[PDB]
């Protein structure tokens, strides 16, 4: 529901101030680690709700290699959920591998949608 643009704006709002970054960033890292999605072979962007015209547009706009890697990650996560087993730390998605690859495309789609809404509303 929340626009990816809004959450990115809030994250940059916080990150611009070390007073809050030094407090929240460790908490955010711990919360992402405890979220449990990495151990299933998923990156943050894979969890995003696809069933949204903006999101579907962004995925359709994704490069072939990234799209195939995402397909494999989703399939692996589904298999792990089905088998009720998790990857070990060796095979789990390392924190540095959460590259937020899909955020640029989603932000571009959101910018296009917002421009459309702004222009047609005048």
């Amino acid at each position: 529901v929340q626009s990816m643009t809004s959450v990115v704006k809030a994250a940059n709002f916080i990150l611009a101030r070390p007073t809050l970054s030094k407090i929240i960033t460790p908490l955010a890292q711990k919360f992402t680690a405890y979220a449990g999605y990495r151990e299933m072979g998923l990156k943050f962007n894979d969890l995003l709700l696809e069933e949204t015209p903006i999101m579907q547009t962004a995925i359709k706009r994704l490069p072939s290699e990234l799209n195939y890697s995402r397909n494999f990650r989703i399939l692996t996560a589904h298999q792990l959920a089905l088998s009720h087993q998790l990857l070990p730390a060796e095979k789990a998605v390392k924190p540095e591998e959460d590259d937020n690859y899909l955020i640029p495309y989603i932000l571009e789609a959101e910018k296009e949608a917002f421009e459309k809404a702004e222009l047609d509303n005048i």
Partner: protein, 88 residues
Amino acid sequence: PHTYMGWWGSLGSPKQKYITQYTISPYAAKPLKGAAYNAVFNTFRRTKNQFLYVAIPFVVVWSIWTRARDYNEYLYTKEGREELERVN
């Protein structure tokens, strides 16, 4: 009908060419390969991972309920009668 799920021919999934799937005919595989190890180790793993999220809310709510129940019991006991008159 831009449903986010289609039928088998086109389920709405993106192209996934470089992935390969593998399975054995069930007539050739064990049904109980992991049952013994799973039911203990895997079940305990799931329970341990999910415990805190159930325990903390449960302990909070049950502590509140126990406090309320004990207070009510004290009220309706003779020793609490006067207080029952004071509170009401």
